[PDB]
Amino acid sequence: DPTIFEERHLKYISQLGKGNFGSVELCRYDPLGDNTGALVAVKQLQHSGPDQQRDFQREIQILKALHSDFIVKYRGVSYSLRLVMEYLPSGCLRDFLQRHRARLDASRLLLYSSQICKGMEYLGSRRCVHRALAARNILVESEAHVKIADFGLAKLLPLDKDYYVVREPGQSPIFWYAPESLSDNIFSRQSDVWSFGVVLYELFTYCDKSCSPSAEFLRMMALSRLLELLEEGQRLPAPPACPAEVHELMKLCWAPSPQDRPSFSALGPQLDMLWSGSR
Ligand SMILES: *CCC(=O)Nc1cccc(-c2c[nH]c3ncccc23)c1
Ligand SMILES: NC(=O)Nc1ccccc1
């Protein structure tokens, strides 16, 4: 098995991020001990109950089974249990957009949109719901290439259903979630499409803090209140210089009824042809 990384050869470098039940660390897999080894990102749990340990075992199996240019690559595990992934050096898309705004044009955002869409299309085809999709957990491999990451809330669909219900949703951020998620804790590939709409909003505002989803809710008046806005048909406003056709795609992603939202398969070509027509 080349899929097993020895604890002793994973050299801690620094922390990339920390949740409440887990963290990701930049490490060097340095078996030769000369610091020529490759950088990897390593996820582990802290203060984890047995429930979280099982979830993490599933998460590892899910990520491992996904083979897409647009999904963060599984490399292996270390055995206590640690998930080893490729390191994507440019970090999360949210911060990247803020930092490099000036050198990213509409074309580039469409490229990212298209990559994320393909990624989500691929997920759907493995009957996986991501749920957490947002600019803060999409990663940047390069200026020309993003990938979906953070499968901490990802779940495979029941084999007899196209959605699932979660019993306790925790204290996750509400501004990316579809109404059926907010009202009944329902999640599906069609709720993912809603979330993708919010990601398009993020991309095309370059994740400016003053018009973030959370900022725009506060202006436009917690869980009960947002849900009421959405049922009334209120949506995030068109980003300042957003191409009309992108804004329209967002609004479709945010259809009240899950069955009226476009599929990722239908979004893909529409985004790709806006790219051709912009560049
Ligand atoms: C945008 C802030 C944030 O939460 N970024 C973040 C958190 C945790 C991990 C990463 C990161 C950066 N490069 C990586 N490569 C692979 C896996 C995770 C990872 C970024
Ligand atoms: N999808 C969408 O428009 N949601 C929303 C609406 C108002 C405030 C925050 C988020």
223 Cβ closer than 6 Å to some ligand 2 atom: no
Cβ atoms within 10 A of the Cβ of 58, count? 13
236 Cβ closer than 6 Å to some ligand 2 atom: yes
Cβ atoms within 10 A of the Cβ of 242, count? 19
Specify the experimental method.
X-ray
In whole angstroms, what is the distance from residue 139 CA to residue 119 CA? 12
176 Cβ closer than 6 Å to some ligand 2 atom: no
The ligand that comes nearest to the alpha carbon of residue 93 is 1
User: Which segments of the chain belong to CATH 1.10.510.10?
Assistant: 93-277
Contacts of the segment 134-137: beta carbons below 8 A, 24+ positions apart: 134/94, 134/173, 134/176, 134/195, 134/198, 134/199, 134/202, 135/92, 135/93, 135/94, 135/97, 135/199, 135/202, 135/203, 135/207, 136/92, 136/93, 136/94, 137/92
User: Which segments of the chain belong to CATH 3.30.200.20?
Assistant: 7-86
44 is written with which tokens?
A: 């582990």
Determine which helix (DSSP H) or strand (DSSP E) holds 14, and give its type and residue range.
strand 10-18
220 Cβ closer than 6 Å to some ligand 2 atom: yes
DSSP 262: P
In whole angstroms, what is the distance from residue 152 CA to residue 56 CA? 7
Determine which helix (DSSP H) or strand (DSSP E) holds 156, and give its type and residue range.
strand 155-156
The Cα diameter of the chain in Å comes to 61
In whole angstroms, what is the distance from residue 193 CA to residue 120 CA? 8
R_g of the chain computed on alpha carbons: 19
Q: How far is the CA of 149 from the centre of ligand 1 (A)?
A: 8
The ligand that comes nearest to the alpha carbon of residue 18 is 1
In whole angstroms, what is the distance from residue 101 CA to residue 91 CA? 15
- C-alpha dihedral sign at 165, 169, 173, 175: positive
Q: How far is the CA of 15 from the centre of ligand 1 (A)?
A: 9
Question: Which of these, 235, 247, 173, 175, lies nearest to 204 by C-alpha position?
Answer: 247
198 Cβ closer than 6 Å to some ligand 2 atom: yes
Give residues (CB < 6 A) around ligand 1.
Answer: 16-17, 24, 41, 72, 85, 87-88, 91-92, 94-95, 136, 139, 149
- C-alpha dihedral sign at 127, 129, 135, 139: negative
Q: Which residues of 143-162 are buried (b: 16+ CB within 10 A; e: fewer)?
A: eeebbbbbbbbbbebeeeee
Tell me which of 23, 88, 148 to substitute to probe ligand 1's pocket, judged by most ligand atoms within 8 Å of the beta carbon. 88
Q: How far is the CA of 121 from the centre of ligand 2 (A)?
A: 23
Torsion-angle region of residue 105: left (phi > 0), alpha (psi -120 to 50) or beta?
Answer: beta
- Go through the chain and tell me how many residues it has: 279
Q: Spelled out in words, what is the top-level CATH class assigned to the domain 93-277? A: mainly alpha
In whole angstroms, what is the distance from residue 205 CA to residue 238 CA? 9
254 CA closest ligand 2 atom index:
1
96 is written with which tokens?
A: 């990247």
- Provide the pairing of β-strand 128-129 with 22-29: unpaired
216 CA closest ligand 2 atom index:
8
Q: Which residues of 172-207 are buried (b: 16+ CB within 10 A; e: fewer)?
A: eebbbbbbbbbeeebbbbbbbbbbbbbbbbbbbbbb
Give how far the C-alpha of residue 46 lies from the chain's centroid of Cα atoms, to the nearest Å. 22
Tell me how many degrees the CA angle 216-173-211 measures, rounded to the nearest 5: 20
Tell me how many degrees the CA angle 109-132-83 measures, rounded to the nearest 5: 100
The ligand that comes nearest to the alpha carbon of residue 91 is 1
In the CATH scheme, what is the code of domain 7-86? 3.30.200.20
Q: How far is the CA of 139 from the centre of ligand 1 (A)?
A: 7
